[PDB]
Design a protein that fits this description.
Name: ArrX
Assembly: monomeric
Structural class: alpha/beta
Number of strands: 11
Keywords: Periplasmic binding protein, signaling protein
Shape: globular
Strand content: 15-25%
Distance between the termini: 43 Å
Radius of gyration: 19 Å
Entry title: Structure of the malonate-bound form of ArrX from Chrysiogenes arsenatis
Number of domains: 2
PDB class: signaling protein
Length: 256
């Protein structure tokens, strides 16, 4: 049978992407009987275009990318239930010594985003500025897309930008690994809660292949090779998507 292609962003875990995904790819080979190819792209836009053009079978995407991918018929497989069952939100960070202690105090300041199609790294904040009839372009003095939550955090720490919007779990993890960097930073604003990042299939994937891969993900925690894949990714199990968990993103997507 034909190769089974899995698409991911290269910028979540630079130099450790195949290290992290290797076991789940082996699990997909076991459950499908198909050779699996890992397809990496730097930007969420590039990953979404692979899904739209049916150039891949399965993709690990995030919340705004999922909202956009649904509109061209990408179908949800499952979401991860991560250890500790975290909640998902954007945090806006500044330096404690900046004197910038709120989102409103970042007007006319320098600001870092990650990926234009990131919720926690862009869209959450673009959505909130609608409240005051602004865009990032008409609110901040300048903006930059780093394509990395860690690099956005580093840019705030080094004073290259005045603030950034990043994933709450990256902030938490960074503060454990680099406590001296974390100590210099403050969360000045938090976004609404959204769902876990979903796994999707291409609109062109057969119903048979869709049902097979959905069963494989939802039963992964009950299979020995599945348990190894889940441990490697620090996921407890995959569970069914709750479409409601992304409605805030759908709403701000329509306000721009």
């Amino acid at each position: 049978p034909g190769v089974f292609r899995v698409a991911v962003s290269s910028m979540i875990s630079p130099l450790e992407t195949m290290k992290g995904y290797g076991p789940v790819l082996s699990y997909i080979e076991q459950q499908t009987g198909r050779k699996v190819e890992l397809v990496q792209r730097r930007t969420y836009r590039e990953v979404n275009e692979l899904i739209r053009e049916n150039k891949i079978d399965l993709a690990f995407i995030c919340t705004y990318s999922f909202v956009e991918a649904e509109l061209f018929g990408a179908r949800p497989v499952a979401v991860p239930q991560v250890e500790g069952n975290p909640y998902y939100q954007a945090v806006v960070i500044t330096r404690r010594d900046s004197g910038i202690n709120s989102l409103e105090e970042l007007r006319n300041k320098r600001f870092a985003f990650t990926d234009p199609m990131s919720f926690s790294g862009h869209i959450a904040l673009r959505g909130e500025l609608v409240k005051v009839d602004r865009t990032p372009e008409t609110f901040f003095a300048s903006t930059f897309y780093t394509y990395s939550h860690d690099n956005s955090l580093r840019a705030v720490y080094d004073g290259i930008v005045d603030g950034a919007t990043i994933d709450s779990l990256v902030f938490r993890s960074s503060n454990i690994l680099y406590p001296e960097i974390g100590a210099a930073l403050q969360v000045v604003h938090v976004s609404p809660l959204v769902g876990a990042p979903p796994v999707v299939v291409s609109p062109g994937l057969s119903e048979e292949d869709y049902q097979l891969i959905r069963r494989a993900f939802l039963n992964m925690h009950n299979e020995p090779l599945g348990k190894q894949a889940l441990d490697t990714l620090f996921i407890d199990r995959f569970v069914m998507v709750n479409s409601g968990h992304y409605d805030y993103i759908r709403e701000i997507a329509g306000k721009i």
